[PDB]
A paper describes a structure:
The periplasmic binding protein (PBP) CeuE1 is an important component of the Fe(III) uptake system in [name], a commensal Gram-negative bacterium in the avian gut, but a common source of food poisoning in humans. [name], an integral part of the CeuBCDE ABC transporter of [name], is responsible for capturing Fe(III)-siderophore complexes in the periplasm for delivery to their respective inner membrane transporter. [name] does not itself synthesize siderophores, but capitalizes on their secretion by other bacteria, such as E. coli. Here we report a combined solution and structural study of a series of synthetic tetradentate analogues of the enterobactin-derived bis(2, 3-dihydroxybenzoyl-L-Ser), to explore the ligand-binding promiscuity of [name], both wild type and with mutations of the Fe(III) binding residues H227 and Y288.
To probe the relative contributions of His227 and Tyr288 to Fe(III)-siderophore binding, site-directed mutagenesis was then used to replace the side chains of the two Fe(III)-coordinating amino acids with non-coordinating side chains of similar size. His227 was mutated to either leucine (H227L) or alanine (H227A), while Y288 was mutated to phenylalanine ([name]). All five mutants ([name], H227L, H227A, H227L/[name], H227A/[name]) were crystallized in their apo form, and all structures are closely similar to that of wild type [name]. However while there is clear electron density for the [name] mutation in its three structures, H227L and H227A are located in a flexible loop region and there is generally no electron density to confirm their presence. Mutation of the Fe(III)-coordinating tyrosine led to a drastic drop in binding affinity in both the single (Y228F) and the double mutants (H227L/[name] and H227A/[name]), with Kd values above 1 μM. Site-directed mutagenesis of [name] revealed that Y288 is essential for binding, as the binding affinity observed in the fluorescence titration experiments is far weaker for all mutants containing Y228F when compared to the wild type protein. This finding is confirmed by the lack of CD signal corresponding to the Λ-configuration when Fe-5-Lic is added to these mutants. The Y228F mutants gave no signal, confirming a lack of Λ-configuration induction, which may indicate a lack of ligand binding.
Author numbering: 23 to 310
Write the structure that this text describes.
Amino acid sequence: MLPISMSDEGDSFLVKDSLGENKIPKNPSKVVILDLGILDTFDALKLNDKVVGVPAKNLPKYLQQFKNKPSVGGVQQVDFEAINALKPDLIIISGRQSKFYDKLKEIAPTLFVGLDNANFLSSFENNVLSVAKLYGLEKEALEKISDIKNEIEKAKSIVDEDKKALIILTNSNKISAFGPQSRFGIIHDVLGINAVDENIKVGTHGKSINSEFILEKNPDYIFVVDRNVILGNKERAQGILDNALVAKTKAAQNKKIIYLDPEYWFLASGNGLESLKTMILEIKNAVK
Ligand SMILES: [Zn+2]
Ligand SMILES: [Zn+2]
């Protein structure tokens, strides 16, 4: 994916990203943020007062300090009347709102902070550092990125050389597997946990699988992201996976069926200083 690039034009930056080009004022003071990871980065950098709208319908528990901000709807169910009312100087989006880019760009400069699943850390650092440059906080952001890299190193220290993981998303009663360079790929691509099939190629929604598959593969770890939790559905991964086939796996027998927090893994996607730190530590705690 194309990175964000920024040029100094005095009172503003000329910014190019994979969706287009924007003139963004320095120190934007009225920012509408539609990417939850970036909202967490604002919080980390003490930029809370700059934030004028958030997608309150999908506001994670870890970001409840933003519960009094004006709502602009949800990450998919965007309230354009509400956005227009706030008269933002900047709107920040990621992939779920790329379909709305032209409409948003008629409200305010609209910055895209996408994540490249083939180059996650590169994408991450670019997004954080570009936001920080708007405010003259590169030094502070670098320090926080360095700290996350140290935590990655520490986590890698305890990762097993040989054990293998399956990464699955559950939605309704469907189980979909993900691998390297896909969504949720950082468990492999960043932390180096081996995948049960390293050469698996999946689409955007993963590879539909069943419990016979899971047992055939016999993973050492099963990392689960339960989208049922986000939807408020009846079924949950714990019930889906409570069967005699899954029980026979190394993961089940070793209590290494790990239910990852979907507010971080599905909603924030690790696109923030807070979320990514937390997610690295979450994995570390699961495998150590
Ligand atoms: Zn060795
Ligand atoms: Zn590998």
